């Protein structure tokens, strides 16, 4: 029936998620990842629910800002698509490596 050209809904999603502040990772998969990573550090650990929310607020903010630098790396190479080489350039310059 109707079909948007590729890039139209992507731009539409950029404006949508730059308007809101909600977390974009589903809470249960993220919490299971936190408990597993922490379990490989120390067994039998309990988490305040706010401690998981604090870890998710920072991680999403870190990845959002990282995707910003990643997007700039792609555009510098006259590209529109971000690639793993763009992330690694950003983290290298950031001093993260």
């Amino acid at each position: 029936p109707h079909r948007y050209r590729p890039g139209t809904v992507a731009l539409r999603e950029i404006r949508r998620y730059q308007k809101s502040t909600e977390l974009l990772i589903r809470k249960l998969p993220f919490q299971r990842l936190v408990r597993e990573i922490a379990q490989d550090f120390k067994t039998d650990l309990r988490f305040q629910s706010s401690a998981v929310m604090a870890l998710q607020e920072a991680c999403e903010a870190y990845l959002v800002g990282l995707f910003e630098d990643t997007n700039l790396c792609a555009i510098h190479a006259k590209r529109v698509t971000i690639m793993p080489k763009d992330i690694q350039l950003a983290r290298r310059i950031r001093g993260e490596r």
Partner: protein, 105 residues
């Protein structure tokens, strides 16, 4: 005028700031003017952010300042954005900014 805040013409507590300065191991001795100066500076910066945040709330047809209004205010003001350059505002989001080469021609 019994309070040290009224004595300085401030809304911020000079007494509490003087306490925190002593209970903070910043120096052996804290002058009498130091808490007054700091509480006023804290008051000025507080007013500067709430001014821009109340404006952002009004632009969004809102009477209450929510965290996004603080984020829009800080990241749109050059000096506020620099003062909080290594700061993350919870539930603040980002500024709408799409790169030009991504726009359709």
């Amino acid at each position: 005028a019994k309070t040290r805040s009224s004595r300085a013409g401030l809304q911020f507590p000079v007494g509490r700031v003087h306490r925190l300065l002593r209970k903070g191991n910043y120096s052996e001795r804290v002058g009498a003017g130091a808490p007054v100066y700091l509480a006023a500076v804290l008051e000025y910066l507080t007013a500067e952010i709430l001014e821009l945040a109340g404006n952002a709330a009004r632009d969004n047809k809102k009477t209450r300042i929510i965290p996004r209004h603080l984020q829009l205010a800080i990241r749109n003001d050059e000096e506020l954005n620099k003062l909080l350059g290594r700061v993350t505002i919870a539930q603040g989001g980002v500024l709408p900014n799409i790169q030009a080469v991504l726009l359709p021609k």
